[PDB]
Every structure is written in C-alpha cells, then in structure tokens.
Paper text:
Secretory (S) Immunoglobin (Ig) A is the predominant, mammalian mucosal antibody; it is a polymeric antibody assembled in plasma cells that link two IgA monomers and a single copy of the joining chain (JC) to form dimeric (d) IgA (and to a lesser extent, higher order polymers). The [name] uses five Ig-like domains (D1-D5) and a cytoplasmic tail to bind and transcytose JC-containing antibodies to the apical surface of epithelial cells; there, the [name] ectodomain, called secretory component (SC), is proteolytically cleaved, releasing the SC-dIgA complex into the mucosa where it is called [name]. The IgA CH3 contains a C-terminal extension called the tailpiece (Tp), which along with the JC, is required for IgA dimerization and subsequent [name] binding. Our work describes the structures of mouse [name] and its precursor, dIgA, which lacks the SC.
Author numbering:
A (entry chain A), C (entry chain C), D (entry chain D): 237 to 467
B (entry chain B): 237 to 460
E (entry chain J): 3 to 93, 97 to 137
F (entry chain E): 2 to 496, 509 to 548
Amino acid sequence: CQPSLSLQRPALEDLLLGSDASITCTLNGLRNPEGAVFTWEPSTGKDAVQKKAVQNSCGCYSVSSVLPGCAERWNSGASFKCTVTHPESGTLTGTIAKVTVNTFPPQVHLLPPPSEELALNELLSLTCLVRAFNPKEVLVRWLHGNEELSPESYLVFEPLKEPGEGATTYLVTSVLRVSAETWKQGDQYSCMVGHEALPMNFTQKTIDRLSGKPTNVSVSVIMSEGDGICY
Amino acid sequence: CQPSLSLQRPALEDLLLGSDASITCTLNGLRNPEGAVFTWEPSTGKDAVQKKAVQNSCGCYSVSSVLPGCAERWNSGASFKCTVTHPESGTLTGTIAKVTVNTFPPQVHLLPPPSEELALNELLSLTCLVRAFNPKEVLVRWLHGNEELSPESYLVFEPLKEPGEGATTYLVTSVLRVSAETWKQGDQYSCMVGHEALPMNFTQKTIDRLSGKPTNVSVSVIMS
Amino acid sequence: CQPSLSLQRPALEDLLLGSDASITCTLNGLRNPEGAVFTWEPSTGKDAVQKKAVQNSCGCYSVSSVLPGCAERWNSGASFKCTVTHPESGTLTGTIAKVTVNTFPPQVHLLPPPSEELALNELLSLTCLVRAFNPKEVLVRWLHGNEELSPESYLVFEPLKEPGEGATTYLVTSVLRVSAETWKQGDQYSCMVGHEALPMNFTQKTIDRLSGKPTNVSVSVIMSEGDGICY
Amino acid sequence: CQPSLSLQRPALEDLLLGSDASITCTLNGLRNPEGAVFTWEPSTGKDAVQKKAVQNSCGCYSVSSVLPGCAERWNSGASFKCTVTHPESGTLTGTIAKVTVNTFPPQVHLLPPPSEELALNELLSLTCLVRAFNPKEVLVRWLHGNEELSPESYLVFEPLKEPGEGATTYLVTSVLRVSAETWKQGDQYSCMVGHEALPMNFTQKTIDRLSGKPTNVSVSVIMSEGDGICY
Amino acid sequence: EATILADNKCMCTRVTSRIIPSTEDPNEDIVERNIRIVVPLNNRENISDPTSPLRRNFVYHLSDVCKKCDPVEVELEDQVVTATQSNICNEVPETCYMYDRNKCYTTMVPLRYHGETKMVQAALTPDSCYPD
Amino acid sequence: SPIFGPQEVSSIEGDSVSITCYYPDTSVNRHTRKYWCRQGASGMCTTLISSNGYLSKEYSGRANLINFPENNTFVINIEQLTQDDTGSYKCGLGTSNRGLSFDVSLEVSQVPELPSDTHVYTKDIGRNVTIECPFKRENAPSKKSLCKKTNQSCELVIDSTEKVNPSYIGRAKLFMKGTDLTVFYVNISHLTHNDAGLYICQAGEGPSADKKNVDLQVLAPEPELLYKDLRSSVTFECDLGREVANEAKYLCRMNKETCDVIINTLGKRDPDFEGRILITPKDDNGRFSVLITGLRKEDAGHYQCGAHSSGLPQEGWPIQTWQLFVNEESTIPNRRSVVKGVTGGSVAIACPYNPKESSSLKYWCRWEGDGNGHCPVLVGTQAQVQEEYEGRLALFDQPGNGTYTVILNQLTTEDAGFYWCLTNGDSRWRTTIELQVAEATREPNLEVTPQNATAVLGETFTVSCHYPCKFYSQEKYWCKWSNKGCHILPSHDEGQLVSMTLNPVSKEDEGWYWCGVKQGQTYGETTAIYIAVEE
Ligand SMILES: *[C@@H]1O[C@H](CO)[C@@H](O[C@@H]2O[C@H](CO)[C@@H](O[C@@H]3O[C@H](CO[C@H]4O[C@H](CO)[C@@H](O)[C@H](O[C@H]5O[C@H](CO)[C@@H](O)[C@H](O)[C@@H]5O)[C@@H]4O)[C@@H](O)[C@H](O)[C@@H]3O)[C@H](O)[C@H]2NC(C)=O)[C@H](O)[C@H]1NC(C)=O
Ligand SMILES: *[C@@H]1O[C@H](CO)[C@@H](O[C@@H]2O[C@H](CO)[C@@H](O[C@@H]3O[C@H](CO)[C@@H](O)[C@H](O)[C@@H]3O)[C@H](O)[C@H]2NC(C)=O)[C@H](O)[C@H]1NC(C)=O
Ligand SMILES: *[C@@H]1O[C@H](CO)[C@@H](O[C@@H]2O[C@H](CO)[C@@H](O)[C@H](O)[C@H]2NC(C)=O)[C@H](O)[C@H]1NC(C)=O
Ligand SMILES: *[C@@H]1O[C@H](CO)[C@@H](O[C@@H]2O[C@H](CO)[C@@H](O)[C@H](O)[C@H]2NC(C)=O)[C@H](O)[C@H]1NC(C)=O
Ligand SMILES: *[C@@H]1O[C@H](CO)[C@@H](O)[C@H](O)[C@H]1NC(C)=O
Ligand SMILES: *[C@@H]1O[C@H](CO)[C@@H](O)[C@H](O)[C@H]1NC(C)=O
Ligand SMILES: *[C@@H]1O[C@H](CO)[C@@H](O)[C@H](O)[C@H]1NC(C)=O
Ligand SMILES: *[C@@H]1O[C@H](CO)[C@@H](O)[C@H](O)[C@H]1NC(C)=O
C-alpha cells in the first residue's frame, strides 16, 4: 500500500490502429484519500485530463493522469517525465523511454490446419505464429479475406520471452476456428500483425486450401520465343 | 481484509513419477496472526501438516495447509471437506471433489514447421496444438525422440476458452525451437500431453519428415 | 495552267529535330507574272515572308509564302489559314491545322541479318521495319555505337499504305549495310525513328550479335518454394 | 510544252512471261493536234502501230507508237532505233537496247518475322530483301505455298541505289502480312523474283516455319529443397 | 565470361549470352544463350491483391523479358533528344509474377477501432517499405 | 557478388576478431536480414549469427552482430576463438539460398611455441626493427656476432667485425650504445618475407652462456578494404614516415603475379587512367592522397603503394596495400563522361554532389596531365577567375537539388582536355568530364544583334539576343559576369527575341554580359559579349 508511481505505456491498438498515444502516470498504492497534483514537462498545450482515484479491494487508492496528442514524442523517442506531489508521497518521478536499442520486427508464419481435422470435415484450426520481436506488446487480428473477424471468434495468447542464447525476443500464437465448408470452398483467411518496428506498422499473411505445395500441384511453363530477338 | 476460505485442487504433477498428491486450503483476508487449526473429515492416517502464512500488499494475511497421501482417494472421486476456526471470522468450512461430470480428453495435433524458416537454416518452430477439454489444467512435455527436454528449453502458453458455444473446451499451445540440422537428419520430436481424461493419463504425438511428400507435383515445360 | 492554292504542312526533320514549324502557303497553277499578296490569321508578330516565284513546265509560275510559327504553336492544335489576293483573278483562301484523330505510333521491328550472309564475311543487311502509323512523314536514323552515320549510307523508302482494312497506316523499311567483321567485333548498330504520335517523339532499337538468333541454347528452370523475390 | 522524243522500255513483266517485246516510241510535249509517222529497224514480222494520243494538264500533247519486236534481239543487245516525223517538229531519232555490259543477279534474302509480332498472335510481317542488281527494274510477287498471291495483299517499295562503291547496285524490299494461325499450322510463303540476269527468268525461296531452327535446344528443371540460387 | 542481355525482376528472368570459339572451326564463333527462370510456388496471379488464386499457368514471352522500357538519350551531331527503347511499354500496371525487393508492394485492409472503420495499409515485404 | 569482405582471415588460439562486410546502398539492404553462416560439407550454410535476434550456442557470449547503416556495412565481432572455428564461412544479406554474400576462408591458427625464451620480433615487411640480444658483461671485450639457424647448419649473418652475410650488406648494421648497457642493438633497414626464420646471437668466442635464439618473422600489411561504387571516385591515402618523405612514391596494381605500375612521382602514368588520376601535393609528413575518378570493373583488385629512389615496386621497402571492390549497383546516375563542344559556342557541364553537403566549397580545375598530375582550380564558390578568361567562365550554384552547373563560353581547341568536379566534401563524388572541341561546324543558336556595342554614359542603351524557336518553351536570362560568377539581370522578354534595356548607364555597367537559357533548373547553350561606353 506504499506509494508507487508508474508510467503506463500507451496501448498498441491505441497507437497503431489509432492516433492517440494516451500515456498514463498512475500513482498507485495510497492508504490515504486522494488530493494530489500532477505535472508534466512537455506541455504542448494539451491539459492532462486527470482521472479519479480507484480504491482497490485491498484498501488503497490509485490516481491516473492522461496525456493526449503525444504520438510525435513516442515516434521520435522523446522521453516523458511525470511529477506528482502528495503529503504521504511528495517526491515521485517516472520516466518513459521508447525501446530503440535492440528492437526486431515480428516474423509471421500462418500455418495450415493439421491432417486429422481435414478428415473430420467439422472444424479446422488455423495458427498464426508471430516470432522474433523485442517489444512485448503486439497486435494480432484475423480477416475473412477482406472482412475483419470479431475478437470473440478467435484467441490470442499472452506473449512470452523466447528462450535460447541471444537477444531478447517474444512469441505469440493466435488460434482461429474455421468450418471445413469455407476451407474447401476457396475462402482466403488472413492473419494481420500490428507492431511498431514493422515498416508501415503492419504485415499480412494469407492462406487457403492451397496452403502451398499440398501434394497436388498442376504447374505449367511456356517459354515462347526462346530463340527470338532479345533487344 | 475479509477472511475467506479458498480450497485448491492438487496439480497434475501428482500422477508424475512422484508418489503422492496434496490438497491445500487457504484463508485469505486475515489481520490476526496464526493460531487456528486446519481440521479435516477424511483424516485417515494423513497428517494435516500446516504451513507458514504470508501477507498481502496491505496487511491481509494468508494461512495455508496441506494434506499429503490423498492421491488414490482423489483419483477415486473421493470428497474432501476443510474446516478451520479463528477469532476474526469464527469457523469457516468448505468442500471439494474431483470433477468428472463433464470430462473431455484433449486432441493433440502436431503442426509442421513453416517453409519460411527453412530458408534461414536457423531454428524451426514446432507447434503442438491441444484442444477439447473441460479442465484447463494440462501438462505439456516435449521429447527429442525419447529424451526429456528441459522446461526452459521449449515454450508453453496458458489455457484459454474456445470461441464457440455448447460447452467449455479450453485449448493450449507450445512452441519448440529445433535446430534445422537435427530436423533434416531425421529425428522425431514428440509432444506428450497429460490429462486425467486420457487413458494412462498421457497421450503422445510424433512428427518429423512424415507428411504427404510433394513428389506428385506436375511441371509442364513448353519451349514453343 | 489553272491557278490553285495548296497549304504544305511543315516537315518532320524541321519539326522534331528542329522546332520551327515553317508552314508554307503556295499559290501554284499560274501562267502569268507574279504580283500577289499573302496574309495570315495567326499574326504573332512574325512577318510572313513572300518568297520569289519559280517557273514550272509549260511556263506555269508558282509562288510560295512561309511562316515560322514555331513547333509549339502548330503543336497546340491551333488552326492556321492563308488568305491570298492575286492579280490574275479575285482572291483565294485556305485552312490548315494539326491532325490527331486516327494517329497511331509506329511499331518498330529491327530485324537481324539473314543467315545467307552470315555464312560469308561480306556486308550484312540490317532492316528496320516501321509499321502501324497514320502520319505519313517519318524520320529514320542509325547509330554505330553512339555515332550517327551520314544519310548517304542508308536506304529509306517512301511510305506506302498497308493492304489490309480498317484504319489507315503506312510502312517503311530502311536498310543499312554493315561489315561482317564489325558485326563480329561486338559493335552495336541501332535504328532510331521519329514520329509525332511517339511520346518523346523518338524510339530506338539496338542490336549486337548476341541479341540476334543464337544456336546452342541452354534453358534453366527453377522451382523456388520460398518467397517470391527475384533478387 | 516543248516537243521532245522519248523511248519507253518494255515492262519486265511481259519479258518474263512469254512475250517477244513491246517497245513504245513516244513524242511528248507536242503542240497542235495532228498525226505523225514512226519508223525504225524492221523487226521480225510485225510492222508498226500508231496508238491514240492524249493531252496534258496545261495543254501539252503526246503521240505514241508501239513496236512488238523480238526477244532474241533483246537478249543479244540489238537496238530498236526509232524515228518520229510530223509537221511543226523536227526529225528526232533515238536508240535503246538491252544493257548487256554489266548485269548482276538479284541476291534474294527471305527474313523471318520478329519475336514481338510472333507473340501477339495477330499479324506477322515477312520481308523479301533483294539486292545486287544493276538494272533497277525487277518483278516481285508472293505465293501462298503454291497459289499465286495478289498484289493487293502485300507491298512493293520502289527500288533504290545502294550506297556501295563501283557498280550501280540497287535494292528493293517487299513486306507481306501473314496470319499467325497459318504459322502455327506450318504453312509456306515464298517470294517470286524475276530479273534479266537470272537463268530460267525466275528465282524464289520459301518460309516453312523451321527455316533453320537452332540446334541443341537444351532445358533443365530444378526443384530441390535447397534453392541455391546464384547472383 | 558471359554477357547479360536482360535481368527483369518483374517476371523473374535472366537472359544472358556469350561468344564461344567454335570447337569445330576456330574461325567460326558460336553464340550461346543461357536463361534462368525462377517459377515460384506460393505467389498468386496478382501479387498486389491477395484475394486472387494461386498462379499455376506462368506464361513466359521473350518479348516481355528484354523490354528495356527506360528511356535513353541520343546524339545526332546537333541535339541530345530523348527516346524509348520499346514499343510495348504502355501504361494499367502489367502482371509481375515475382516481387522486386527495391519496390514496395502494399495492400489495403479495413479495420475497426471504437466503432469506426479505417483503411490501414500493410506491407508484404518486411525488408522493403521503410521510411528511409 | 556485390558483397565484399575479407576473403581470408587468420587469427590465433584465444583471440578476438572483427570482420566487416559491405553491401550496396539501399533501404532494403540496410533494413534486411544480416546473417553469418558456416558452410559445411553438405553445402547447407549453417546459420550462426543474424540481425534478427539469433545466436548459436557455440558463439553464445563470444560474438555479436552490429549493423551500421551510416557506414552502409555490418561488422561481426568474435571472441574466445579456437581451432574448431576454422572453416568456410559466408557473409551476406537475406538468406544463404540466394547469392548476395561473400565467402570467407577463416583459418584460425594455434600458438605453436616460444622455444627461444628471450626475444621474438614478428613485424611487417619493409620496415625497421631493433634486434636485442643481451649477454654476459665478461664477454663484452670479445665476440659480438649473430648467426642464422637453419635445418642444415648455422651461418654467421651479422658481427661487429664486419663479418656479415651478403643478403644483409647495407640492409642491416650493428649499433653499439653507451650508458653501460651490455646488450646488442642491431638494425635492419630493409625487411623481406625471406628474411624470416631463426637467428642465434652470442658474445665471446668461447662457449658462453648467452647463445640466445631469436624468432624473426616478416609479415605483410593487412590490405585495407575499399568498397566503392561504379562510376565513382576513390582517395588512396598513403601516409608513411618522414624517412621516405623525400623519396619517390608510386602506385601499382597486383596482377596474376607481380605488380603493374600505374603512376609515380616521376610523371609516368598509365594510358588507362589518362585524365582520371593525379597526385596531391606532398605535406611535411610525406602523406600522399592519390585520387581516381570514373571507376570501372578493371579498377578492382589489390593496389599497392611504396617508396624508392626509382619510384617503382622494389622488394624490401615500405608497403601500403589496399583491396578495391567496385559495386556494379551504384547510385551515381549514368553521366555522359564526354562533352563534344564547338569553337565559339558554349558548354554547360553539371558537377554533382551529395545534396546534404551543399553547404560546402566547390571547385573546378583543368587536368594538366603530363607534368606531374595537377589540378589548378579555375573557379569555385570562393575562388575568383584568372586573367586568361575575364569572362567565358562562371559558376551557377543551384540552391540544393544535388548538383551545380558550370558554364564555359568562347570555346577553342586549346580548351579540350579533362575537367574534374572537386569539392570540400567527404562524399567523394568527383566526376571527370572529357571536353572534346570541334571546328566551327554551324552557326550558333544564340547571336546578339549589336556586336561592337558602344553605349553612351547617361543615355538609354538596348541589346537584344536572338531567340530561336528551338528554346521557345525554355527560360531565358541575361547576367553580368564577374570574377566570382554571373549576376542575373531582370531583362525584357519577347515572344522571338530576348531584349535587355539599361535606362540609366554607369561606367560600372561595362564588362561581359551573357545571354543564356534554362530548362527548369539546368542550363544550356549561352553566349557572351563585351559592352563598353563612350564619353
Ligand atoms: C563506421 O565504421 C568505422 C570503422 O569501423 C567506425 O569506427 C569505429 O567504430 C567503433 C564502433 O562504433 C568505435 O568504437 C568505440 O570507440 C570509442 C572511442 O573511439 C576509439 O575507437 C578505437 C577503439 O579501439 C580506438 O582505437 C580509437 O583510437 C583512434 O582515435 C584516437 C582519437 O580518437 C587516436 O588518438 C588513436 O591513436 C586512434 O587513431 C578511438 O579512440 C570508445 O569510447 C567506445 O567504447 C567504442 O569502443 C570506434 O571508436 C570507431 N573508430 C575507430 C575504430 O577508429 C565508425 O564508428 C562507424 N560509424 C559510426 C557512425 O559508428
Ligand atoms: C630504416 O632506417 C634507415 C637508416 O636510417 C632509413 O634509411 C636511411 O635514411 C637516411 C635519411 O636520413 C639516409 O641517410 C641520409 O642520406 C642522405 C642522402 O639521401 C644524406 O644526405 C644524409 O646526410 C643522410 O646520411 C640513410 O642512408 C638511409 N639508409 C638506408 C639503408 O636506406 C630507412 O628509411 C628506415 N626505414 C623505416 C621504415 O623507418
Ligand atoms: C492487382 O491488385 C492491385 C491492388 O488492388 C490492383 O491495383 C489497384 O487497382 C484498383 C482497381 O483498378 C485501383 O483502384 C487501385 O488504385 C490500384 N492500386 C494501386 C495501383 O496501387 C491491380 O489493378 C491488380 N492487377 C490487375 C492486373 O488488375
Ligand atoms: C636504428 O633504428 C632506430 C629506429 O628507427 C633509429 O632511431 C632513430 O634515431 C634518429 C636519430 O636519433 C631519430 O631521428 C629517429 O626518430 C629514430 N627513429 C624513430 C623511429 O624515431 C636509429 O637511429 C637506428 N640506428 C641505430 C644505430 O640505432
Ligand atoms: C505507425 O504508427 C505511428 C505511431 O504514431 C505513426 O506515427 C505512423 O504514421 C504509422 N505508420 C504509418 C505508415 O502511418
Ligand atoms: C512531340 O512533338 C509534338 C509536336 O510538336 C508535341 O505535341 C508533343 O508534345 C511532343 N512530345 C513530347 C514533348 O513528349
Ligand atoms: C553445339 O551444337 C552442335 C550442333 O549439333 C552440337 O554438335 C554440339 O554438341 C553443341 N555443343 C554444346 C556445348 O552444346
Ligand atoms: C546436339 O545435337 C546433335 C545433332 O546431331 C547431337 O548429335 C548431339 O548429341 C547434341 N548434343 C547435345 C549435348 O544435346
């Protein structure tokens, strides 16, 4: 219940899919009532809409302070410093610093369903393996070729650090259930990954019944005018 | 801090090479020190050993206890009742029992590595997709073709409910980074899943260079 | 002879290689002395020059009057005219303007020398087939490895209308004799064509021995199962 | 209109088809309408024939007379010295014969179509490059394998003197449009050429699709697990 | 060594040639031609639009390979005019079987955000499409 | 192929290494995936390090990968090396299945022995060393020799009694110091790879306890890598000591065997580089900065710089080697490389540079050639114009845009040659232009009407420049020439002349006025004319 200030990193979905990098300077762990004041260094005119104090079941309060319109600061890596004052916790500072020392882009791998689920013809399980990315926070969604699927239709697990000798990376796996009818009926299902280190922030992968060399491939090649004139 | 009794079921590690299991009781939300007694009903030659009590971030204590030697009893669906008495809340009691009313065994599905990682010659991500089971608690252990890999070596995620309707069927996943050299040499990398619903409490799946080989691809070259 | 008016559009070499559009207005068919007057509608300050009169057969005079309206003016599509007043009779008038209705660009086809001459070491005949273009006038030039040869070595033929049906087009086949030795040393002999429809008004085709017809060919097809990058 | 003598050479068509001769002695630039007389070296059998006269644009007139001579006197080089006489004009005498001092046979060269048109599958172009011949006159025709093709389906550019040194070598070109469909079936299209310095008075060459195709058209397919691509 | 005549990334194809002394006649020289084609197996009929089905046709014309659409300056002892090197370089984008690393191919994908839709673009080539 | 790096590297047991690998300048190759794989007997290149976050267990904590987009390269550091690390390695981008990569034959040695317990000397070639050989004080007034150990027998090579070896006459000498040292100091002014081996020094003719062996090894300098782009320039910096400053340097190229000389300080020059090569002045430190332009494939190879009285590669003298690799995938736009001008007309050459270093100094000289590789600046951002011109030459610094233009009117046959595009910038984009002159072929497209202009003070004067339709759609300008450049003059235009009126007239208005054109940003044909005023 002791004082504890922490700068919450803005939500990735609130940073890539949108354009408001709402930073929060949470002052959690207060046995006493509220009555504090917040202050920021990069005062760009946007007043910090201060939020109320929530009293968790444990019996302590937690205040918050929002900062809108700080997307340019995050993209540029400008550090964010928050200062809060309170009788029980006078001096308290928090620092934000975008990770730009050992960041890596995620590697997406949309795997096809197994061999048994195909024989059942009931439901298929598609997996989107996102690998290699130092920033833990990552965004993952699915689409029915061009229609986005609701989050309640698929699952997204929590990132976990990848073991082994080397740099620090994370890994996630999202599962999507699909009907065999739409699978055989040539319906493209894609996996969209949103990340900061990526170029344009997004990367897409698609798959269908023709996952790629599925033991049945009818290839053709026609090299016409092979002996013609090559200007 | 309001005292509340929370009963915990033994973990899946009891059916392992281990011998016995262990039921656990806990009283969270106490401001007074220890001194109570964790009495049980099925105390048949089982010592109700107690444990140290910890505190919360605001002073709420947490008592605990254990009951060793209840593996066969719980396996037979035997019911257990916990009983404790402390001043801050009088007497608190609870009951538990192995859940087997809606049991479903998992369905392992080993997926092959993607063709993209093959061009890198680095590690290959092998996935072991589990699905279809009510008890979210599941055991996952990889094998290097009859060799037990360390837990820190491979990776395992947490169970999550399925996005369907009809019943509660959780699912889990696990990724293993295999050296491309060993993968090409021909070494089986099996996936062992543990669950009380399965016969022998264990199911195994294997996968390495076994798949519809793409040797039937037809190429038609025409140099008109 | 009976007098008559004729408006001669500017040449091509004087329009593409040069940007003056000296549009001419000739008053031919006169069997009497000169002494006429020429007037133009687009009086852009450039005084129209009334050139002298020549004498054709059977003592038929012929007067001419040019107007350097520059290529830009004639290019914009402005309609020019020529009102002339002659002494032998009353007056006469004509009109002229650029055409861009059924205008098509040429389809150059630089054919290689025939095998009948390759067996020897004498000269090799290079043909530059120009096809499909409505504007009759066409320019044809050659280059021996960035060096323009004198026109006294080419063999350009007058355009002739195609025998097919539909649109109106013309064809020409410029020929150039090249030493077989130079053809073996690896020297280029390109063919350039100038036309109005052509964007940039110039097209080129260059052919050394290797672009021609080879003998022992070796094809190598590859089946890449990874990414679709050519590198 | 200045009266002047003129002798016309018989077209090579009749000479290379089964006709003795047919020289025409004309007196152009004639003034006043009135008959004339034409004498010459007595040929074998036929005498003289006076053809009808016409006028010109500005009023000039022209009287003509034909002499169905002999082909033997042509091959030998004998001359059909003409002589015109009529009032208002003097007695003009001219002489013409076969150029039997420097004659070269036409070096025909049949080229294939380009690789571009061969791929569009619409209409191909075939050129009959003819060169090496002192008399610019020449008879050109095409064949549909064996049938006589019409001149309304192809072009025949006017001959032109080559830029060589020494002899007066000429050159001609003839473009023929062919459908790619006939090409796919393996048809033929030859180029008939008739000249004076040609035994049998004819020479042709065909265009069966092979026309010396390249030898050893190799090919290889690579579909190994390891691409091993080079750069 | 061997001489290059065309290396088109759009429709990956490498057409090279060389002059080798004829083994049967040192005076004569043979003109050999080498071609390298890379037929993929995971690309689609359209590489910019992923809804199109897999491409198993692969038509390869030699006229489309050695195209050289890029212009070139010409000197005729007076002006340095510009000129094109092909008659089939028209401009709807043409079909490109394989990707070109230098180029950046993207696709439009709609997404939702707090009850609103947005047209975010995605990159198909992680290495490419970087702001630099 | 375009990837370049050390083809062969040699380290030692328990030592660190820092391998560098270049690649073309593109956003892809800078942000793509770097990798360092080892090639085995099966052909598959086993990956070991990558810029994505992979690190093999064998190199765990020993190596590390870094990507330098500014350098446009990527370095590979390694530590705790051993003998098992020997093998055929690679260094490229993307994946090993492609070709973008450069093979490496790293052969890590092991420390064999230190049999001679006192003094090892393993230095470079053509350098100077100080051979130390202590002994016993009792043996000072006696023998002071040094022999060469061999598998056959020992041979006296150096001695204080002038009993030396023929191969060391002049190339070495013994030096006896004072200060009561009791140690031998022998110099070897000239070293060669053959001089390596073992030597034995000893004092006293009798059996002394100072028969001390020596391990001499003559090495070659590590060839400095130079990854340059095609049609670019290069600066060979040959900085040696003051000992060879007063000597004649040179620059040769290693062929299949010996080194083919290309240029020296004696005026010699290879016809292949005639016009695209020179030598900078010699500073007090004897540093040379040879410059070359118009790089081509034939320029790639191993370059060597030395020094000798003859200015030619003689074995046994200082050496400085380089390894130049020309990248065919260059970013420099294909320039014409030749400019065919006509006497009396004018020329407009475009000198390029990196748009980021626009705030620098730019110059323009004429390649003398035969004398000694010169480059006398004729005009620059700060330099004025000489007296031989007094016009017919000026600069036009385009605000940014990458390049700047140079004008040269009143052309004549004496102006033909080679002109370079210098600038005080490390971009090294020095382009060489070959100026070809021809006789008066045709008339100029621009001709002023009043030739002998004789204006009057305080009286309006007018001058009109002809304006053919050839440049109807181009911009025009009149500018007064100065020793530093040409100042534009807002004149009057006509739809076909370019008028210029001076309502007032001052004696300062005299000088050389220019009539030129402009195609958006670049320039074209121009003409000059002198204007004088009467009284
Ligand atoms: C582009 O590539 C070049 C070549 O690799 C890079 O140059 C070196 O880069 C490394 C890694 O970034 C730097 O390492 C740092 O060096 C800091 C101090 O710099 C010293 O580096 C050398 C380390 O051994 C040292 O020898 C060197 O001494 C030289 O300069 C002195 C004057 O500065 C001079 O007195 C000496 O006689 C000698 O000539 C430098 O003092 C160090 O503090 C860091 O901890 C880190 O080790 C090198 O410094 C760079 N310079 C070198 C090796 O000379 C370059 O950085 C690359 N580009 C960019 C943007 O980094
Ligand atoms: C290694 O040491 C030798 C010895 O000093 C260096 O060469 C020596 O250079 C000096 C230069 O001062 C020469 O002596 C001078 O010669 C000039 C004539 O040019 C004379 O006028 C001076 O009075 C003075 O005597 C000396 O002869 C010369 N010796 C040899 C053997 O070349 C050499 O440069 C050194 N090398 C390195 C890499 O340091
Ligand atoms: C392949 O797909 C691409 C991307 O959709 C197509 O390019 C787009 O075409 C549509 C419809 O014509 C336009 O509205 C877009 O502006 C285009 N996007 C671009 C050019 O980036 C392309 O047309 C498709 N290929 C073919 C042959 O149709
Ligand atoms: C042997 O070599 C050393 C090292 O080169 C020489 O030392 C030089 O001495 C001169 C005169 O004192 C100095 O000017 C130089 O600067 C010294 N060398 C260096 C590298 O600084 C020495 O002179 C040579 N001769 C002897 C007899 O020792
Ligand atoms: C990626 O997200 C950042 C977050 O602010 C944004 O600035 C940037 O514009 C996004 N990328 C693109 C291509 O818009
Ligand atoms: C080609 O010339 C015509 C006639 O002057 C002009 O209309 C056209 O714009 C020119 N093409 C260009 C400038 O690309
Ligand atoms: C080249 O072609 C000739 C023609 O038949 C053949 O005999 C020879 O073997 C071929 N050589 C190669 C190397 O292809
Ligand atoms: C090339 O073709 C000739 C034709 O006779 C044949 O003899 C020879 O074996 C062929 N060589 C190859 C390598 O195909």
